[PDB]
Amino acid sequence: DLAYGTGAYARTRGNLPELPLVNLFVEATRSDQRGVVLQSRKGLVEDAEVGTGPIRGVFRKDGVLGGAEFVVSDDELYEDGVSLGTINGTGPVSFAAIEDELLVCAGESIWSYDGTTLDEVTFPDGADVTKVAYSSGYFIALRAGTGQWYFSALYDGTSWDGLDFATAESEPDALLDIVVLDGNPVFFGTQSVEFWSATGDPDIPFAPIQNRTFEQGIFATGCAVAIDNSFFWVGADKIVYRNDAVPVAVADDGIVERATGSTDLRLFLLIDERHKFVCLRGDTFTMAFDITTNEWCEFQSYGRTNFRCGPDMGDDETGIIWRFEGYSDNGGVLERRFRAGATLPGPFRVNRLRLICEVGTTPNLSGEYADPVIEMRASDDAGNTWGIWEGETLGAQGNYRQRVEWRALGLFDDPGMLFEHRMTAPVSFRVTAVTVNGELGGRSR
């Protein structure tokens, strides 16, 4: 019984063997005795075409402005596919909405939409705002380059006073992010994390929680998300941290290796039926930490250097909003790759390699995918050099007793054996176990 990698572990330092997990994540199960299986991610299918550029942010709240769709295609704001106006550029887009007011920030200025027109909001001293949030009836804005944050009036986003500001004393540099946790704002700067709570006093609405700070800052703006009564952030050392009495590093050495090689990091959240993926996206990678299983997986889109779906389920270079359905990635090919194997103290003969996987569940009967092909490729030098891909069939529709087994793999030696399995068909896929030298039986399968 070979043991497959339950998480993406690609550490290039020391030439350690790599165990990538592409478009597959570990899910606990009750039918199988092993408890866990590898489940494929669902493909991306277009839901709405908005704008003519990359999506920067998507807002959809049923109780706000009738539940309209607010999309920031490039530097434009769209309401249910209807253009509203031009928004500032470079900075990431943040939303803060109430029953009749919606504030949008793009790192330069604040724009207010009340259902009638989109108006620029005059900020004190004309300074640039990096992040805008809403908390306990107030609107909070971060001034760019300073460690002070401003708060607006009660339920009004267009009324900002120059004297209504508070400064994070323990962080002498500028703040970068806000996270609304438990109804209270948490401020992430370059050197510390500050916990603030609403005291209910009209003159001073927020006060800091003394003796509760984290010495690790935030890497940049947009690297903090909130989920499961906690928040995840990216530290100044490019390590992903979870909120706790003592924050823990949920990112292993390989994750930090991948993060360090990229200059831009963005942390967002993706939702599957029961799975909450905290997704960290770089320039050439997009990893996802599963909340339920505490394992890292890798999401890739075929033909592109990075995953198509960006923050808030938006495309990275087109005006398409995605949704998860049918494992047909944009009508194309969804690649699922993983690695199994083991280390050996000496010689070992592999005669059969069986894969307990999905069989006979293809929805195609007249196409090239009537019978999908899954390719296995073996290696003996810890995955450094590989052999030729050998393809097997998962069986046609209805063939539920198909055996996915290779034959006579050969002698393997001290470094170990490593088998890489890849399937690139737009069909459902799941791996239960990988068995080596299984029992030779059967009944007319």
Binding site: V333, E335, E368, V373, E375, I388, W389, G391, T424, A425
Partner: protein, 127 residues
């Protein structure tokens, strides 16, 4: 002089350096097994059957690939034996008219005109 005769094509050789007859070449999308089209001529109009089958002598027909797409080549023996595979197929062979070939053909043409006009001049000056 004398020149040893060689085969006028490049078939795939087996372990014993014999041409594989009926070898099947599959052209897929890179990293995938999705069928990708191949074309007989540079016009990219007539489509060859993607499992391209060589004749009994191992000769392959002229295969033209869409340069806008990247290809994976998977060759197999006629009975299905998996011979070789290259996932990123980079056609790194240059086949354009470099100026050496251009000057050679221009010199050949000029010498042809020179010979023709010399022949005409000889015919006029002799007859």
């Amino acid at each position: 002089a004398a020149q040893l005769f060689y085969l006028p094509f490049r078939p795939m050789l087996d372990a014993n350096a014999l041409a594989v007859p009926g070898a099947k070449l599959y052209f897929y999308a890179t990293g995938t097994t999705t069928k990708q089209p191949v074309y007989t001529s540079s016009a990219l109009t007539t489509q060859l059957p993607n499992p391209v089958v060589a004749n009994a002598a191992g000769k392959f027909p002229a295969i033209y690939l869409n340069d806008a797409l990247t290809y994976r080549c998977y060759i197999e023996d006629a009975d299905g034996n998996e011979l070789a595979d290259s996932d990123p197929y980079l056609a790194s062979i240059a086949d354009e008219l470099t100026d050496e070939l251009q000057d050679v053909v221009d010199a050949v043409e000029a010498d042809r005109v020179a010979a023709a006009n010399s022949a005409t001049a000889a015919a006029t000056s002799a007859a």
